[PDB]
A paper describes a structure:
The γ-tubulin ring complex (γ-TuRC) is a structural template for controlled nucleation of microtubules from α/β-tubulin heterodimers. For ascomycete yeasts, MT nucleation occurs mainly from oligomers of the compositionally much simpler γ-tubulin small complex (γ-TuSC).
In vertebrates, MTs are nucleated by the γ-tubulin ring complex (γ-TuRC), comprising γ-tubulin, five different paralogous γ-tubulin complex proteins (GCP2-6), actin and the small mitotic spindle organizing proteins Mzt1 and Mzt2. Cumulatively, while dimerisation of CM1 motifs and general structural elements in CM1 motif binding are conserved, interactions are divergent on the residue level to adapt to variations of γ-tubulin complex architecture.
Numbering used by the authors:
A (entry chain M): 4 to 19, 24 to 36, 39 to 54, 59 to 75, 77 to 107, 232 to 266, 271 to 492, 502 to 620, ...
B (entry chain m): 3 to 40, 45 to 54, 60 to 67, 72 to 86, 101 to 142, 144 to 173, 183 to 221, 224 to 276, ...
C (entry chain l): 3 to 40, 45 to 54, 60 to 67, 72 to 86, 101 to 173, 183 to 221, 224 to 276, 288 to 306, ...
D (entry chain L): 351 to 370, 390 to 417, 425 to 479, 494 to 556, 566 to 574, 586 to 608, 1474 to 1535, 1541 to 1582, ...
E (entry chain G): 56 to 90
F (entry chain A): 58 to 92
G (entry chain C): 33 to 48, 51 to 81
Amino acid sequence: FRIHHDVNELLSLLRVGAEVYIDLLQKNRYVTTTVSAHSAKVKIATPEDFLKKYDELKSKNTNLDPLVYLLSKLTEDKETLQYLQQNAKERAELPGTLPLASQESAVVEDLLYVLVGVDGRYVSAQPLSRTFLVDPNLDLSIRELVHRILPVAASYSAVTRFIEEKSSFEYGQVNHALAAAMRTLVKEHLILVSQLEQLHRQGLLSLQKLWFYIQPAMRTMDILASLATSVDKGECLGGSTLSLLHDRSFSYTGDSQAQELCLYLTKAASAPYFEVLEKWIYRGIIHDPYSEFMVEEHELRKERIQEDYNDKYWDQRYTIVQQQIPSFLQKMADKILSTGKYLNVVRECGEIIYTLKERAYVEQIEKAFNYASKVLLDFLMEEKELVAHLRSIKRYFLMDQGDFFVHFMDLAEEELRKPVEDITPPRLEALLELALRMSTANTDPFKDDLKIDLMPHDLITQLLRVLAISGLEAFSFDYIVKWPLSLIINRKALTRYQMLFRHMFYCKHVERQLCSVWISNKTFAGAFTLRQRMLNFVQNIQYYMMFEVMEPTWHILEKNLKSASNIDDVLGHHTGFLDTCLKDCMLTNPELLKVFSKLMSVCVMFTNCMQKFFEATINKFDKNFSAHLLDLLARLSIYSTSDCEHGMASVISRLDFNGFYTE
Amino acid sequence: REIITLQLGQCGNQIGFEFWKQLCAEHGISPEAIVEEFTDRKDVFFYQYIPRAVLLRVIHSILNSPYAKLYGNNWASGFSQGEKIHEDIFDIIDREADGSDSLEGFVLCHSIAGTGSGLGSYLLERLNDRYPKKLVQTYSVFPVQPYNSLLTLKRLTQNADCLVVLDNTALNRIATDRLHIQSFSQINQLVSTIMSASTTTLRYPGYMNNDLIGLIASLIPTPRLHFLMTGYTPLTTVLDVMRRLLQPKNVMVSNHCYIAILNIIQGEVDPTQVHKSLQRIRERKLANFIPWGPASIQVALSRKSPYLRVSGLMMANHTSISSLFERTCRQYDKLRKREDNFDEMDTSREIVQQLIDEYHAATRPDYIS
Amino acid sequence: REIITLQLGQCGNQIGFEFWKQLCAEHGISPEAIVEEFTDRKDVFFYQYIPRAVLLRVIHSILNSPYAKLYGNNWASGFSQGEKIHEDIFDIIDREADGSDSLEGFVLCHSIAGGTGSGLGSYLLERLNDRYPKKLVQTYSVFPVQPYNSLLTLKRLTQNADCLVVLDNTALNRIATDRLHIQSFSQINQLVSTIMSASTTTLRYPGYMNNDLIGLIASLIPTPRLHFLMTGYTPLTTVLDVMRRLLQPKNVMVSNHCYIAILNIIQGEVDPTQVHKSLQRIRERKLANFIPWGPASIQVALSRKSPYLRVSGLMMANHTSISSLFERTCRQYDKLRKREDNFDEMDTSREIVQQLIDEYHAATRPDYIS
Amino acid sequence: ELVKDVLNVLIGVVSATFSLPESISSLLSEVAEYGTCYTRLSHFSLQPKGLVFQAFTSGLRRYLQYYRACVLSTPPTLSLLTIGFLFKKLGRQLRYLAELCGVAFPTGVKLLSYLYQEALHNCSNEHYPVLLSLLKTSCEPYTRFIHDWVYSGVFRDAYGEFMIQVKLYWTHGYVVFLKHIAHDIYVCGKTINLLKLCVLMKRSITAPLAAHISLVNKAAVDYFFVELHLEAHYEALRHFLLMEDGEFAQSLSDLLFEKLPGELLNPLVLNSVLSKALQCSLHGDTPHASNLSLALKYLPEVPDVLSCLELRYKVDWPLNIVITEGCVSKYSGVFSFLLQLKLMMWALKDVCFHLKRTAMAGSVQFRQLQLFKHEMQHFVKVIQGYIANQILHVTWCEFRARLALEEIQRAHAEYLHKAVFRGLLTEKAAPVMNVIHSIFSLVLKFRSQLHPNFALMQQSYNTFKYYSHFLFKVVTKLVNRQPHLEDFLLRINFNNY
Amino acid sequence: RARNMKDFENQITELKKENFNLKLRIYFLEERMQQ
Amino acid sequence: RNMKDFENQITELKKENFNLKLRIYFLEERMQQEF
Amino acid sequence: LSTEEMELYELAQAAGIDPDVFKILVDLLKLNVAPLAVFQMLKSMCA
Ligand SMILES: Nc1nc2c(ncn2[C@@H]2O[C@H](COP(=O)(O)OP(=O)(O)O)[C@@H](O)[C@H]2O)c(=O)[nH]1
């Protein structure tokens, strides 16, 4: 989330919302675009400084082309420059005696030795970009024509220095293949030099003849020299070198002479990169001798996900380094990460050729992704099945099994009303096991994963703080799962299950005590009408909470997991199911929850007065509940009209069925 | 938590025993109380399986049946018999209550039409004093008979927390309109289906109403108004079921409004039209409720037994039941004018009149106080 | 909106059975009420497949038919029979109505040829108005002590039924004798069942115009007193052939005079390009006479034929020439009156129909209004 | 002998007499002028800005090498007159080439056009082979670019020399050779690019070009109809937007009009009425039926006959180009009017049901009012049939047999334009739209008065009769000044005046 | 000019449910700063 | 309802998203800097 | 400012801007944001 920083920081640097300004960029975004340079350059053009200092940047292979286009646009609008200038100001404040006929043979024969790399009798090399000296006194025509043939010798000097230097072990395997690939090219040139050496003895190798002969070699040496300078002047290794070769090859797409040479060099130097890609795609093994691949690994402890909520593991185990992208696999970069990530988790539990204008490897990696995704899905569905575990967590955290719970409160009612830090965990755990054995929960293969825990904060204030930014209520459940399952069921999603349970448990518990009051007074007269409207509210919110939010969304999830494609969509669907469920609850609303919690506080304290066995308090209780309920109805009526939400409309219809509370 | 069933009289024993065969058939248990192999909560009605029933000349016919190994005409005479067998009957009751894990309710099935009538009236009086914190459920059956009915009704209306009316006049009506029977052996067949589905959410675990206590406080707001009817449409979606139950001929009854309606949706309907069915019935205004206090209608879902198609049962508590009591009142006056202290019937006459006044005034906008 | 049909008498049961057989064959429905593998909406006539049919000797033969799985002689005697069984019959009527989501009309196929169906039809119409005031009722009456029963039921028909389609036997047998050369009842009822299916072509298949029964009936009926219709079906080829062939006296099934409104249905795939050209040709040659007082026009609608089962065509119209048949019935009444508990309602039926016959004859004059 | 001196001037080397009797100086002067153009051309065409200019330079250098090959080949040593006559028919041609070049000068497509006009200027003369050879080797980069879209379609640009450079997705600018192919080539490149993301007779160029262009265009059209169900959208679009589908037209209209402010405009109610209506449609519940949205463009504060409400279809990327935004907007416009037509049928049916419950109470007053309703009904029905026939049937007959890439775009605009023309929504038929709106207002006034006010009802009917007569008069006068409107008078008037 | 009025329901419910998800992250991480 | 409040309402919800997202960014580097 | 950021900065001054602003511009372009969107950002922001 760096773009949101850039807009705010730019908002502070200059003087002026930012919300719309970032939406122009979010919809626009590993891909790199290119634009015309000649049109932009002439548009800019003291401009003279721009024209010579530009050539250095492209030599360094520097994210260059998009910015240059931006300067051309800024130059068109003069007011932008004036404001930028104003903002900048504000912030700142012996051939001479030898026949001319026979000197041609001597000149051409000595020019034959400098090609090999050895200094000649007349044409020598000035010690260190290589420069040469021919003669201090020679005919003007001869010197000028030799100077035309001179640069091929300098190009040979550069390439032979490049291959000798780039043979080190500290430059990556891709550099080794590139250096080795061109070793045959210089060898063939030397053979042609030797062949012309054997031809020169017959006298049929003239100065003009050599100039025509070296023309195919002149381009070959020039392109090799340019590649040598580009690699040398900018540190290129791994995918960076491959990108440079690919970009250079695509540049010479209208010559048909310099394209085959670049194609062969790229396809010969891509073997080290493609060979290690094969094991990274088909398997989960990365050798990675030097930081040259596009995937890197950070060491993180596995138990971190179960221990806490904040630390990411799915997005931190493997990340893309952008500098090393080969520039022709960026559109499938994310799929390649999925292939290795999917295979890595399942391996520990139980051929590619470079082509031009062809996407054979693109199709190859896609079906490899399909197989890797398919094998992972059936791995977690056939054995260590996901659906049964989700049905199990729904049984306890979501109170699917009512027989289990109805016995639990009836057994631990006296030990949960005591104040906090006064009940030991073992006595609760023993009661938990006894209730589970007595109830119909014995038919649960995974019944041994429920643990009692007590939170330090109450639900209402915790929800109030997270939106504005003890006793029995401290009770909470927890669950434990193994590593292959824990990847999607983690603390990031589990904390929503227990947060939902807390409100579910509080509403269920208060209804049980309220229902128990009905039998206490079952044989002074105004408490009956209060109870009727009182109980019909808690049940109505319970029914809406349970039979229109819990089941319909869960059945959607059950149908949704039957057509999964990859675990990425599985986790997205699961976090979608939880998030929409909380929205459909009465939570996630500050004004709505505060009046609801105030009403629930009225609920619990009224029942405490009944067992005390006064006439001046029942009317006060009635006037408090009616005013709270009327305020409650007003808020949801407003919230369901201005904002679209069928749940709030349902509860309004469910709470009142006779047109009462018409005010 | 456990419930012990009690059967009294010829009619009561027959209905309870017939209900027991239906439950045994639905569950995976043999008639000899042995589990058959061929999920569902069974601690409510079974003990590790000996049924928890206290059988009290029908018993002679029962003991010959294959389920054997599984286990006068005056109200005053019945009362005297109950008083004299006081020790005999309560000995079995006490020896069962202690053995239970936690008593929560009683099941009483009988007919207010001889020996069971007097025994039932006396039993409820003693249970309230002996056990004042235990729920009592009476599955009364309706048919000399004027005085017997009102004397029983006096005890039932104030000593039984719940009551379900099952009259033979309505039973024969459906038995002729939809079954064409023209016998007692066939009218009770519908009763068994109603009885089996009456507590289907208690036996089968569910989201809500897993305990008996929660199934009364939702329907019965005050101890005076404690009468629940029955309904059964299947003799197709939830909306079709909802409309058919409210139809006047379907209800088991031989201005006016409802109080609280409980519906059990036995079908396998997906829980997505359970809400819009309530939405459409509200728009059409198929029925009305009390105008003074808020009233709500609720529906519950369950599943069939796989060992054994959509069903539905309705719990109706309407003020229209005053017609049946007024019918008993009018015949009592005719019998009184045509013929120890003979004062008990006077107390029964006044108390039911207060119930009629309470029932009729329950529809007024100012029923409170 | 579900629509429920009722059959009365041996004639009504016979035509109703043939109507159901043809309609079932039109859709991909087997005779055993099971859909076959083989756009159309069968929900209006069929309910989840069983037809919403009510039938009141002949029934035994009907059950013997392969379509079994698809389910006195005086007016006073017919009235008495309905009274004794009114509650039993209305029990199945009400439960069907409650089972239906929202009933729209009540299709009836009853005969007034001296049978008990006329007596039952009179009672059913009386109670349907009494109990269902917001529910439309329509009956496809058929015409032949015979003069008596043929006019007593007219008293109730003119004040209870909102719409009425007449199919007399004077023109039906003429078509059968001419174009079929029959010289039986089934041979003459098959043509009637063909009209019955084609009458509701725009109802079974969705369309932009006239999506419900009240849409079609309202246009043809200017006054509830004038609630009579006549039908024709010339299939026995462009739009001009269908429009032209639907106006000759040989096709109208009725034994000055002018039309009031014309609605014609074309069930073929004929090109809509030439529909207006046919309309201009009809107006230019003047094959039809309309009312002089108010602006009266002609309307045509298109619908798609069933692909399971050729350009079809049906006409629905109201003609003041229908008054001729009533005058024949009244004349037979006066002749039979002098030839042979108080005979009071029997008189007011004559007065009411004589009031109707006056209204028909008064609608031809240019000063019908006011 | 001076033969070596004269022969060493056309090569370019200097001589003793050539720096950088007595009439012989004139002869050497003519030969010197023959060599100076050669030297100027060599100095001007030495570089090996534009790709087309480079090819022209290469061709010129190739020609010069032949000229150098021809000289110093035949004559060892001849007479001075002989060498002058021999180099006469060739020296003038060399001067002409010098005049053709600069010794400014265009580049890109302009240079190709300039050379082409030069060839036609002197076609008959002996310069045709030279000019043709240069033009053949100067169009090589252009031919490579042309073959690029035909086979690959990956756009290539060197210096923007071409006349062509680089949601709607069609912002590729476009603005001699025959114009019948320039536009075809320009649209051919876009079509293949779109599919990637989902005598002077020019016969050698178009011979392998027409066949491939036809093949690509036919493949593009076939792909849209078969694997994208484009025709399926049109039949589904007509069902919903044009409100042709029964039991959905009535259901949506009925639910909205049952209510009639702060209601009927919140997202809760109007987004749900669409959802409820789909089940009652019985023709839908498919991915086609999705993307229907009830949009609102105006919020009225509060007898009226106006109720603003839109209905916009939504499409994905591949078909966003075929269906224009303006076409969808006009669908809403015709839908808004067509929905207003259905407002009578709901209201007229309601008052028909309202009068039904009145019935004993039979007199002149009751029957007189009901005859007015029948007269009111017939006018609405007769014009509704005209709208249905003109818009949904005859217009839909076209564009169904018409279809069997740019063809789709032109045809769709014509189909809608005819639909809105026959629907009387065009501004040319404003008086017809105005007079009917008075009838629209009058009938709703009759609806408002649901016998305490019979005189008001009679006055309203008489006002309608006068307005209806005025409508017949205005439409009759407009026939002289629209073949579509001709059918309207036949519908409204039939055996009357 | 005029909003779709149907995606508005989908758009408003997506942002609000996302905001609560984002709100729940800042609080559980801020308490870690305190702890 | 004003047909203009919708623009204001959408902006307010988007404000609650962008501003809260910014505070996340600032606090992330605090965790990185603290360690 | 990094050497590369200063390296790009010098050409911007040569062609004819605040160094902290320019660093943000380079950062946005590094994150694959198209240059055309960035100008439309500036145009609506510098007005
Ligand atoms: N509906 C119904 N009622 C029954 C059945 N069996 C008995 N009864 C009723 O029970 C009454 C007879 O009660 P009775 O056994 O004589 O009472 P007791 O002498 O005190 O035990 C009759 O009036 C019947 O109405 C039955 O199977 N179905």
